[PDB]
Amino acid sequence: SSLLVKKLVESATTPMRGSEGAAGYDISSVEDVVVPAMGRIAVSTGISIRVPDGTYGRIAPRSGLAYKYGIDVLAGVIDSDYRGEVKVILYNTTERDYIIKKGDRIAQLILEQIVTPGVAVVLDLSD
Amino acid sequence: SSLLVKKLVESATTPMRGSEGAAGYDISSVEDVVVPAMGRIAVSTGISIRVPDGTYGRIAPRSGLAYKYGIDVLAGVIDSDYRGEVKVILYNTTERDYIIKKGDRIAQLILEQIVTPGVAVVLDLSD
Amino acid sequence: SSLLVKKLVESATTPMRGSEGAAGYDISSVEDVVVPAMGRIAVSTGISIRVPDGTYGRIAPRSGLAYKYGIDVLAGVIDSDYRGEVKVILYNTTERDYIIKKGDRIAQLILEQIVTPGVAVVLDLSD
Ligand SMILES: O=c1ccn([C@H]2C[C@H](O)[C@@H](COP(=O)(O)OP(=O)(O)O)O2)c(=O)[nH]1
Ligand SMILES: O=c1ccn([C@H]2C[C@H](O)[C@@H](COP(=O)(O)OP(=O)(O)O)O2)c(=O)[nH]1
Ligand SMILES: O=c1ccn([C@H]2C[C@H](O)[C@@H](COP(=O)(O)OP(=O)(O)O)O2)c(=O)[nH]1
Ligand SMILES: [Mg+2]
């Protein structure tokens, strides 16, 4: 029901929500790195999570970094049984490099509800 | 419960759904612009929204523009408490430019259900 | 309620989930192709689906292909009334080409819950 969070390093930051009606929790870097121009990387968050059953955690793009620096968020699907560290793959769509300092909010964890019903095979999906 | 929509300009178009089983509402441009090759922009929708509590609005990619012109949708997370204008950041993955005329469907607003439970810290997520 | 699946070719593979807490079903290619460097394509899955009402199927990025080969997933929104073949548009963010063999897991189908309430127009979203 609640969102579980295991801290893996000193700096690690307990995911929180920027506001009441906020769609997601703030995922932040625990490392100083550089998302190279037209390049990509996996940033360290220093944390591992367990999204509530009946949902999966989506690593979603932060508006600011997107509009101003053209930072895209690759991958992003964290399954509810996954126990490893959350990595945030970042793609720099720009010709310019982009710098990340420990503590910067690099993304947001949205807890999206899904369904995992069984799969039946048919010959006709209509009607 | 319903999807609220405040119109900000003349041209603004009340978000609607292309069909009964449609996943989202049609977000359209209220400006004539050009998403430059290997470039990006924030298109004006002329509208502000309030997605139903218990969800957030996702600006999602339209299939056609994606397959034919390689148009990607950056950012995209609209929180339920946000009151400003909805901007649709578009990334042109192609070497060719791409033109948008007022009224063109530039994306789709999907209302996705999420959860915002409190966050507990543990030492072990398993078991 | 269940996830319907119509097989369109010999090779077609009945979508399954890699694990109990898995967020999505494994979508795989039924064709040998190459996502060109800084290029994109629509891969054939040999299948058509009908996601449960009250949800839409999201073609989501697979972590491995993202981190190691910089493969992004364009479009991705499959509506619940859609009856055609599921195509997986893939964008190669790298300078290197990328090869897909029949049977390779090219993505994952996440069944996300949404809402499609009516749309009301207001002058003020706040309060
Ligand atoms: O593609 C997008 C993504 C977000 N927003 C809106 C929704 C959200 O409520 C607000 C967020 O701005 P911000 O998050 O406060 O700035 P930042 O992302 O740098 O924290 O911008 C858009 O209009 N278009
Ligand atoms: O990556 C994708 C995205 C969408 N579709 C399917 C789902 C949807 O039901 C249909 C939509 O085609 P369209 O929306 O009618 O064309 P357009 O996007 O130009 O409106 O295509 C795919 O097969 N692959
Ligand atoms: O941006 C992402 C996407 C996924 N994961 C985690 C969540 C998931 O549980 C695990 C999946 O690794 P994998 O799927 O087993 O490898 P592959 O994608 O090649 O199947 O990686 C991340 O840390 N960051
Ligand atoms: Mg993307």
Residue numbers in the entry:
A (entry chain A), B (entry chain A), C (entry chain A): 2 to 128
Article passage:
Glycyl-seryl-tagged dUTPases yielded cubic P213 IL-3A crystals with unit-cell parameter a = 105.68 Å and hexagonal P63 Mu-22 crystals with unit-cell parameters a = 132.07, c = 53.45 Å, γ = 120°.
The 141-amino-acid deoxyuridine triphosphatase (dUTPase) from the algal Chlorella virus IL-3A and its Glu81Ser/Thr84Arg-mutant derivative Mu-22 were crystallized using the hanging-drop vapor-diffusion method at 298 K with polyethylene glycol as the precipitant. We previously generated Mu-22 dUTPase by mutating two IL-3A residues to the corresponding residues from PBCV-1 dUTPase.
